[PDB]
Design a protein around this ligand. Structure first.
Ligand SMILES: Nc1ncnc2c1ncn2[C@@H]1O[C@H](COP(=O)(O)OP(=O)(O)O)[C@@H](O)[C@H]1O
Lengths: 121, 60, 242
């Protein structure tokens, strides 16, 4: 189980780093994770746009770039070597990471029964 | 000030909470952990020991 | 396909007249519910003089125009295939039906000319998967799926272009073409209306799309030169704006 510890200074990049961490913990580790979310933990619509991309694609390309992307490639390469799959190019390992996430990551959303908030969401 | 109240167990009063800071969520939920003879609560990325004499009062 | 017997004049007249009636039917009322399509069919039946099917209640929208210039029902073209037991409710499998076959024909017609089209309909309703089935049916056109969000920006299309295509210099000028030769790339947008508009009622993504589709290319921001699109066409889908 994983909850994001949200405070008043919990800006966008903090959640971005947290989502990078959970994506590393799910696909690169083949470790099934339950992602606990509440709307109280939400402070802006950017959170939900990024979750929308994640849910509809199984991954968000925005998180991983530059040195972070290379570290992801190293981690997914070592994970694939551990499981028994040999891949070299970036795209195949990225698709394998996406499959690992879509099979392991589980995102849950908790909301109070607000019909107006429901249609806004 | 919240750290000082949690350390010394001193009562604390808040005059304005309309701009809520969710740091109090573990405190309000009383998410305490009993490790050894210590009572700890996580605040953000740092862990704090609780004193039973501590009490908080939020006001509007 | 008939070198020995090319069509004669009367067959051509029959075929083109029936196809024209079918064309008004599927173009003027192509973006409305079934009752209003039937209303247009009844109105054109009252107004036209072209020969029409004698179906007591079946609208001519259910009937195609054969290559022999005859009204043949779409039901005959619908096969009865049996999927494997392990492939039930699979994402890939599509079971043909009246709507599926009619939309397949429309997609074939509108992709032969590479005119972009938008699949507007309620969530689900077999929009995305019918489009994918039509695309995979044609071998030459590959598929790329871009999920447009409320913050969609043209740099996503630029990223897709530099990922799947390449810029080359030609006597006419610099040209954007897919890295795969002799292939027509399809940029599917699952939610083309989802991107928000600016404070001035303009969505940058739709303007960029219309710019390239009507001008046959776009602008590369690095050196600010006209770029000619080759072997690139778009297909869209979206929920109703309401
Ligand atoms: N002709 C068909 N053959 C097989 N499945 C169909 C057909 N028409 C509709 N469906 C079902 O309806 C659903 C359509 O959802 P989908 O088209 O993916 O939604 P969207 O277009 O909003 O992405 C699919 O899950 C599919 O199983």
């Amino acid at each position: 189980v994983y909850q994001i510890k949200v405070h008043r200074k919990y800006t966008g990049e903090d959640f971005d780093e947290d989502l990078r961490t959970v994506l590393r913990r799910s696909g690169c580790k083949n470790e099934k994770i339950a992602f606990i979310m509440d709307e109280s933990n939400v402070l802006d619509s950017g959170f939900l746009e990024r979750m929308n991309t994640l849910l509809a694609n199984g991954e968000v390309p925005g998180l991983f770039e530059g040195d972070e992307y290379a570290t992801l490639m190293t981690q997914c390469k070592e994970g694939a070597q551990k499981e028994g799959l040999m891949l070299d190019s970036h795209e195949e390992l990225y698709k394998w990471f996406t499959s690992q996430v879509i099979r392991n990551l589980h995102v849950v959303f908790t909301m109070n029964p607000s019909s107006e908030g429901l249609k806004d969401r | 000030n919240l750290e000082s109240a949690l350390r010394f167990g001193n009562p604390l009063l808040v005059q304005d909470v309309e701009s809520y800071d969710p740091v109090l969520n573990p405190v309000l939920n009383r998410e305490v952990r009993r490790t050894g003879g210590r009572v700890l609560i996580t605040l953000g990325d740092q862990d704090i020991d609780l004193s039973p004499s501590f009490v908080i009062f939020l006001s509007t | 396909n008939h070198p020995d017997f090319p069509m004669q004049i009367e067959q051509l007249e029959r075929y083109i007249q029936r196809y024209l009636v079918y064309a008004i039917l599927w173009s003027l009322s192509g973006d409305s519910r079934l009752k209003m399509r039937a209303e247009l069919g009844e109105y054109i039946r009252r107004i036209t003089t072209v020969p029409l099917p004698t179906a007591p209640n079946i609208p001519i929208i259910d009937y195609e125009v054969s290559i022999s210039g005859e009204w043949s029902p779409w039901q005959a073209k619908v096969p009865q295939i049996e999927v494997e037991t392990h492939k039930v409710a699979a994402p890939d499998v599509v079971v043909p039906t009246l709507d599926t076959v009619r939309h397949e024909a429309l997609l074939y017609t509108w992709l032969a000319e590479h005119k972009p089209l938008v699949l507007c309909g309620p969530p689900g309703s077999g929009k995305t998967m019918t489009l994918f089935s039509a695309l995979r049916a044609l071998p030459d056109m590959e598929v790329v799926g871009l999920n447009f969000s409320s913050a969609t920006t043209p740099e996503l299309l630029l990223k897709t272009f530099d990922h799947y295509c390449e810029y080359r210099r030609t006597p006419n000028g610099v040209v954007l073409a897919p890295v795969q030769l002799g292939k027509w790339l399809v940029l599917f947008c699952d939610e083309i209306n989802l991107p928000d508009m600016d404070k001035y009622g303009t969505q940058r993504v739709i303007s960029f799309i219309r710019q390239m589709v009507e001008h046959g290319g776009f602008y590369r921001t690095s050196d600010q030169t006209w770029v000619k699109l080759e072997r690139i066409q778009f297909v869209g889908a979206c929920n109703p704006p309401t």
